[PDB]
Amino acid sequence: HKCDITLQEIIKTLNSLTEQKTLCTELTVTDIFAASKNTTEKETFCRAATVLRQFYSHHEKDTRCLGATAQQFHRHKQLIRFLKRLDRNLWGLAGLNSCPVKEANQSTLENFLERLKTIMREKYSKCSS
């Protein structure tokens, strides 16, 4: 069980990510949380980090997400910035660089981020009085 400041940086990013919806946030990610057994909390971390990396890599220049207006475009840029911030945190927490992602249900990025936010705050609670 790690109780590093890193957890607060994860939660902070999740709070700017979920309050801001874009064109892209309703696209999909493998629902790593549709398993009937997440295994090892560092494996969970590797698992969320791996799926956020797949997302941002493939949607960074996705015509469906870039936007038309400067507002839309700016939001998009911020979405990509935050996913990379969050990923690097996740990877740093995992300290594991290879894990197996085998689920098939997909969820929107939006649901996925909200779930993760929830386990991140549970983690936080088990850490503090």
Next chain:
Amino acid sequence: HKCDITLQEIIKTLNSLTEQKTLCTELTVTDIFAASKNTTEKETFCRAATVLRQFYSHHEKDTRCLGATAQQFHRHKQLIRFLKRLDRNLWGLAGLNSCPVKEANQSTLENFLERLKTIMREKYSKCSS
């Protein structure tokens, strides 16, 4: 990985449970799915079975849920019927009668049932072509 007909009975109950909201469905259950590591799919099952048992036992005669009208009362009865149906299925699948439930985030029964529905259909997918 079990692929028993039981899974369809679990999904069937979940489908009548989630389409029917009552006075009680917005009350809480320990979010067994706020862990950063569900362990063993039979443990997961034991875990959901244990928390649904706690719910129905304590809310069966909950004045907040019994209802005023015959409609409300009837719905309530059906909610309790289905939770017991689902629990017995879960327990039957677990084949494990003691597991540790240690999370602290709570979710409404409604969110909890929707999540479980999702892992139950993932289970179903990994079972069929």
